[PDB]
Design a binder for these strands. Structure first.
Ligand SMILES: [Mg+2]
Ligand SMILES: [Mg+2]
Ligand SMILES: [Mg+2]
Ligand SMILES: [Mg+2]
Ligand SMILES: [Mg+2]
Ligand SMILES: [Mg+2]
Ligand SMILES: [Mg+2]
Ligand SMILES: [Mg+2]
Ligand SMILES: [Mg+2]
Ligand SMILES: [Mg+2]
Ligand SMILES: [Mg+2]
Ligand SMILES: [Mg+2]
Ligand SMILES: [Mg+2]
Ligand SMILES: [Mg+2]
Ligand SMILES: [Mg+2]
Ligand SMILES: [Mg+2]
Ligand SMILES: [Mg+2]
Ligand SMILES: [Mg+2]
Ligand SMILES: [Mg+2]
Ligand SMILES: [Mg+2]
Ligand SMILES: [Mg+2]
Ligand SMILES: [Mg+2]
Ligand SMILES: [Mg+2]
Ligand SMILES: [Mg+2]
Ligand SMILES: [Mg+2]
Ligand SMILES: [Mg+2]
Ligand SMILES: [Mg+2]
Ligand SMILES: [Mg+2]
Ligand SMILES: [Mg+2]
Ligand SMILES: [Mg+2]
Ligand SMILES: [Mg+2]
Ligand SMILES: [Mg+2]
Ligand SMILES: [Mg+2]
Ligand SMILES: [Mg+2]
Ligand SMILES: [Mg+2]
Ligand SMILES: [Mg+2]
Ligand SMILES: [Mg+2]
Ligand SMILES: [Mg+2]
Ligand SMILES: [Mg+2]
Ligand SMILES: [Mg+2]
Ligand SMILES: [Mg+2]
Ligand SMILES: [Mg+2]
Ligand SMILES: [Mg+2]
Ligand SMILES: [Mg+2]
Ligand SMILES: [Mg+2]
Ligand SMILES: [Mg+2]
Ligand SMILES: [Mg+2]
Ligand SMILES: [Mg+2]
Ligand SMILES: [Mg+2]
Ligand SMILES: [Mg+2]
Ligand SMILES: [Mg+2]
Ligand SMILES: [Mg+2]
Ligand SMILES: [Mg+2]
Ligand SMILES: [Mg+2]
Ligand SMILES: [Mg+2]
Ligand SMILES: [Mg+2]
Ligand SMILES: [Mg+2]
Ligand SMILES: [Mg+2]
Ligand SMILES: [Mg+2]
Ligand SMILES: [Mg+2]
Ligand SMILES: [Mg+2]
Ligand SMILES: [Mg+2]
Ligand SMILES: [Mg+2]
Ligand SMILES: [Mg+2]
Ligand SMILES: [Mg+2]
Ligand SMILES: [Mg+2]
Lengths: 58, 185, 159, 48, 172
RNA sequence: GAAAUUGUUGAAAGGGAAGGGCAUUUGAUCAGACA
RNA sequence: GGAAUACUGCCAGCUGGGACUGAGGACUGCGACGUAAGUCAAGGAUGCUGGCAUAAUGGUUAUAUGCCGCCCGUCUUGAAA
RNA sequence: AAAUAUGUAAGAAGUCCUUGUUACUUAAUUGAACGUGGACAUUUGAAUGAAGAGCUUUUAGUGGGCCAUUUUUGGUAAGCAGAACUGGCGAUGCGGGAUGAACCGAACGUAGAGUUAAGGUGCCGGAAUACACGCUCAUCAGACACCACAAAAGGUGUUAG
RNA sequence: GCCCUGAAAAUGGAUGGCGCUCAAGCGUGUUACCUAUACUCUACCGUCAGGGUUGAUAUGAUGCCCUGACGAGUAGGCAGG
RNA sequence: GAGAACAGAAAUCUCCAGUAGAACAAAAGGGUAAAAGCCCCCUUGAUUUUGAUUUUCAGUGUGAAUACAAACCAUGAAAGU
RNA sequence: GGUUGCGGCCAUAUCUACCAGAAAGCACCGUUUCCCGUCCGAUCAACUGUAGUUAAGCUGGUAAGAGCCUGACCGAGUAGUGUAGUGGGUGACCAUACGCGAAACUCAGGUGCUGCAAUCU
């Protein structure tokens, strides 16, 4: 016996009960897949300034 | 009819007494819902809720986690409140004085505290001394240090530990756990 | 049976704009991007390497990375009943800085002005935007302009 | 603030009736819906 | 569409910097209320000029009252109408006591004879046929002959109770 | 010593099923409350 | 020239008939009228009068009458089928 | 080259000044990133709403669908077969369409009073054998959406053009 | 435009039936009137929510009191009985 | 298109016009002119390491692809690729 | 203002026909020892700046020119379209209500703007 093949019927009804959640945003997102040359330096950079803001409270 | 825009007859979803069945727990609650209704002090309001908390949402605060909190700047004289049990911790070698107010103290903790000449207070003695919770430092334990939550969110590329009984090589470490056996995770 | 390859359905999407084929003009390359820049995306069919997938055509995203010949763009794509984060490695020929903010930025710079200009005078500001208000009363004159009276016209056929 | 403070008014159905034998055409077409301008007071009064 | 009033409506293309004081057009409009009247105005106006309500302004609306509401008058009426199969100009003559009565029965007649509903009709012109013998349709001329008199034969009085004890009579 | 199902007695109703719902008339039957 | 009137709208103008309801149970509020003492229709009915004191009202029941009512269970897109 | 649909943006995670960190980067303490110090509050930066918002765990049933308007493919067509968006039926009674899954109106705690919807008001049957202007006479008249069919072609019947 | 011809099927039969002809028909207009589990106001039930109340010397602190909104339901979940 | 012995519709030579009307293995659609097409020159980056990303998606796998990092090379005066 | 070298936007810069261009600059132009490339010093390489020319390039101007760019209640509130009705019609289809709104057409206006450095009667 054949039967229905496909439909989107009722699918956005379902998506909207719990509702298409807005994308959610963060201050300080991740560096995931950011350039490694950049990221390597960035590291030693932050090390330094930290150290220079430990000097601040000697 | 009404085009409703919100699910009707919804329960707020907050415990509103404890599920616990303990007289004494109920009395402490009797105490604090009175204080919470008549003292506009936020502390009483927080404590009232913490008493409803199930065992899991009450992880044990340790005596060493206690000792640390007191090394907070300007905090060493505060009386730490813990709505739950307080456990001992051999790993700290030196313990402060202070005054811990809590639900339960393990044998070892109450000793360690008292050995350095502190005080172990029950929450109701805490009330009589600090009805507005003056000078209190509330601590909570690690909720997500539970073994169970390890397995929450299990799926591909989530890194979360199988629900597994026996463990060792040849318990779920092959196809889909390494590049050389089909694929990986 | 069906076919659903990578650039399927894109006949006119990636197609090139009438009388505008050829080299891409050099300013497309002198332009400069930093992290956080908002960019709009549109594929240049003439540049086959580093090309956005059609779904991201017409889409706007934020820069998250800068490489030699490229920028990484994050887009939120909503799949299911939820958005997920997508990172796009695009070559500079498929990206342009967005104007979607120029009215904001222009407005802040100016809102800062009208404020200082007000504050150090004697307050009274009002610097939120407001929708089209309905218009006010008005007296239209007849002098030079008496009303002309039209009526409707009969049926005709010209053909 | 003033208007949000006001809880949505709850009118009864019009006393005189609606005018019209069918509500769901525009006022202008002999119906009831749409902007009917100053004729809104006749109605609302009959429902208030 | 109901019981008509006649309105002068006046509108005009929203002003602009380079064209303050645009030109002002009037229509006389038979409608049952001013709301329908302003609609009709915009309806024909977008049929004549480049405007629509969005970009234009009604300037003045005024009901015009019949000049001599108890003067019998011979009205020549001009109409454009749509039938099922085509559209059609047409001239009728109506005798009544005001342009407003006259347009009531035209719409009545158009509906009754040609099955034309209000949407499908366009008044071209209504004007008072001054000199008799420029009256053209007979069914009117008939009522201008001198010393006119007619009986109203076969009289039917409406009974007010269900039963009657007589057997009626249509003398008159 | 239940029920299906039966005999008798008593009461009722019945123009091609019966049973049911809202309501009241009519018959039968009955609790409470008055002080 | 000077009125009227219709039409539409307003009045925190007055006023008649009719229906349903009377939740609440000391006081506490916002008021109104009064020179005042008081008074009131102002955070929900009281006053006065009669009849019965029982199958009268009411319940139950059978019947009659008006309108209405297909056989439940099930599988099914869909069952009184 | 539309309409309808569609991405982003409308601030405190914001804008401006001062000038630290590095192994990246520059001819260059140049830049890039991350910072320390300082300037400005709710007309702090459109509307409307917000019985608040966010987050976590676990588990049932389900995984034959069907219909209506619109868009729409195959077919002469189908109460046929297959998609698009929404609204429905399925899972749902109530009023209307005599009747009827899906149309119209309207979604249901037990009730009183009122008012209405869609649909009606000769009698069946609650409600004008109301008012008003025309039209129609059928020896198979006609009579209300979905809906329970009719066409080309003709009439010196009659109406108005 | 209305009407007439074009217009043929099987049990007797359907504008819902009767019947209707200046209609009880067709087109259009104006009033009034009828009546849904819908709308408005009110009582009672239940659900959800927000308040208030441990002060003894009497009776439920899971209580008592105030206020507001809401109530369709297969499969299915949970709850109080 | 116009020109040159044999030479013809079609052999080889030249000039003019030439937006691609061609070619780019292959289906079709994109793309391309001092090239992505045609001729020549030098080559092995069709290599080594292990991650991120886009499509299909459960945001699994697989295929295919993208932009980087760390190598070693090719080519080019070079920027580069 | 011209011109050059490097440009940006890439036809208001393109196309066809014709005329005009001072000064400088570009240019055409001479040569073949040298590096270099060709069947061919035409291209490409080098050397002279000397021996010659505005003819071409280049620049500009003309044209009821082709094209291209702009504008407009020109056409048109037209086609098409979101939304409504127990609207019309046997149907095909079509009106109406609240909105959004083209393209062709037609007429007019235009025909490169401009950055950095050097140079020039
Ligand atoms: Mg099968
Ligand atoms: Mg099937
Ligand atoms: Mg299936
Ligand atoms: Mg552990
Ligand atoms: Mg793998
Ligand atoms: Mg295909
Ligand atoms: Mg080109
Ligand atoms: Mg490639
Ligand atoms: Mg009234
Ligand atoms: Mg009434
Ligand atoms: Mg009345
Ligand atoms: Mg009706
Ligand atoms: Mg009222
Ligand atoms: Mg007049
Ligand atoms: Mg026995
Ligand atoms: Mg009996
Ligand atoms: Mg009964
Ligand atoms: Mg009472
Ligand atoms: Mg009472
Ligand atoms: Mg007695
Ligand atoms: Mg008794
Ligand atoms: Mg008695
Ligand atoms: Mg009975
Ligand atoms: Mg029945
Ligand atoms: Mg079965
Ligand atoms: Mg079946
Ligand atoms: Mg949008
Ligand atoms: Mg609000
Ligand atoms: Mg709230
Ligand atoms: Mg589940
Ligand atoms: Mg499941
Ligand atoms: Mg399953
Ligand atoms: Mg199944
Ligand atoms: Mg529907
Ligand atoms: Mg089912
Ligand atoms: Mg239903
Ligand atoms: Mg019914
Ligand atoms: Mg029917
Ligand atoms: Mg009958
Ligand atoms: Mg009746
Ligand atoms: Mg009447
Ligand atoms: Mg129809
Ligand atoms: Mg015919
Ligand atoms: Mg005829
Ligand atoms: Mg029939
Ligand atoms: Mg009938
Ligand atoms: Mg009629
Ligand atoms: Mg009710
Ligand atoms: Mg109510
Ligand atoms: Mg329920
Ligand atoms: Mg529900
Ligand atoms: Mg190809
Ligand atoms: Mg080149
Ligand atoms: Mg290979
Ligand atoms: Mg697998
Ligand atoms: Mg010279
Ligand atoms: Mg040589
Ligand atoms: Mg030479
Ligand atoms: Mg050379
Ligand atoms: Mg010359
Ligand atoms: Mg040159
Ligand atoms: Mg030209
Ligand atoms: Mg449309
Ligand atoms: Mg509808
Ligand atoms: Mg329709
Ligand atoms: Mg049309």
């Amino acid at each position: 016996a054949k039967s229905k093949n496909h439909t989107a019927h009722n699918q956005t009804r379902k998506a909207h009960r719990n509702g298409i959640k807005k994308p959610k945003t963060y201050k300080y997102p991740s560096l995931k897949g950011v350039d490694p040359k950049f990221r390597r330096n960035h590291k030693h950079a932050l090390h330094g300034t930290a150290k220079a803001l430990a000097a601040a409270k000697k | 009819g009404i085009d409703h825009t919100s699910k009707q007859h919804k329960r707020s979803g907050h415990r509103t007494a404890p599920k616990s069945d303990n007289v004494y727990l109920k009395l402490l609650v009797k105490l604090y819902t009175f204080l919470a209704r008549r003292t506009d002090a936020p502390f009483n309001k927080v404590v009232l809720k913490a008493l409803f908390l199930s065992k899991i949402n009450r992880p044990p605060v340790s005596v060493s986690r206690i000792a640390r909190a007191l090394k907070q700047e300007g905090a060493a004289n505060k009386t730490v409140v813990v709505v739950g049990t307080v456990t001992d911790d051999a790993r700290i070698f030196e313990f402060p004085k202070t005054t811990v107010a809590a639900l339960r103290f393990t044998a070892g903790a109450r000793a360690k505290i008292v050995k350095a000449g502190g005080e172990c207070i029950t929450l109701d003695q805490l009330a009589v001394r600090a009805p507005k919770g003056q000078n209190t430092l509330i601590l909570r334990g690690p909720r997500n240090s539970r073994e169970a939550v390890r397995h929450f969110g299990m799926g591909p590329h989530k890194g979360k530990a199988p629900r597994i009984l026996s463990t060792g090589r040849k318990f779920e470490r092959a196809r889909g756990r390494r590049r050389s056996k089909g694929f990986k995770v | 049976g069906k076919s659903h390859g990578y650039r399927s359905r894109t006949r006119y999407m990636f197609q090139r704009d009438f009388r505008k084929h050829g080299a891409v003009h050099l300013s497309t390359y002198l332009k400069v991007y930093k992290v956080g820049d908002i960019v709009d995306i549109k594929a240049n069919g003439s540049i086959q390497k580093g090309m956005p997938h059609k779904f991201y055509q017409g889409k706007t995203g934020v820069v998250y990375n800068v490489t030699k010949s490229s920028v990484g763009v994050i887009i939120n794509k909503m799949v299911g009943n939820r958005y997920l984060e997508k990172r796009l490695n695009l070559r500079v020929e498929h990206i342009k800085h967005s104007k979607c903010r120029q009215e904001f930025l222009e407005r802040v710079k100016a809102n800062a002005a009208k404020r200082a200009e007000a504050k150090a005078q004697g307050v009274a500001v009002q610097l939120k935007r407001q929708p089209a208000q309905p218009r006010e009363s008005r007296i239209v004159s007849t002098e030079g302009n008496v009303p002309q009276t039209l009526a409707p016209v009969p049926y005709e056929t010209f053909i | 603030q003033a208007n949000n403070f006001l809880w949505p008014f709850k009118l009864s159905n019009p006393s005189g009736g609606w005018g019209v034998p069918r509500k769901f055409k525009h006022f202008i077409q002999g119906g009831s819906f749409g902007n009917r301008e100053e004729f809104i007071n006749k109605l609302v009064k009959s429902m208030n | 569409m109901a019981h008509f009033k006649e309105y002068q409506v006046i509108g005009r293309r929203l002003p602009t910097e380079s064209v303050p004081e645009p030109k002002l057009f009037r229509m006389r409009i038979f409608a049952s209320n001013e709301v329908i009247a302003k609609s009709r105005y915009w309806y024909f106006l977008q049929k004549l000029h480049k405007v629509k309500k969005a970009s234009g302004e009604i300037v003045s609306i005024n009901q015009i009252n019949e000049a001599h509401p108890t003067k019998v008058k011979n009205f020549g009426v001009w109409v454009r109408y749509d039938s099922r199969s085509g559209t059609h100009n047409m001239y009728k003559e109506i005798r009544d006591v005001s342009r407003v009565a006259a347009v009531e029965t035209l719409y009545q007649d158009m509906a009754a004879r040609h099955r034309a509903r209000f949407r499908s009709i366009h008044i071209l012109k209504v004007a008072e046929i001054e000199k008799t013998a420029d009256v053209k349709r007979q069914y009117v001329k008939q009522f201008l002959t001198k010393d006119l008199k007619f009986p109203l034969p076969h009289r039917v009085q409406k009974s007010t109770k269900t039963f009657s004890y007589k057997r009626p009579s249509t003398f008159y």
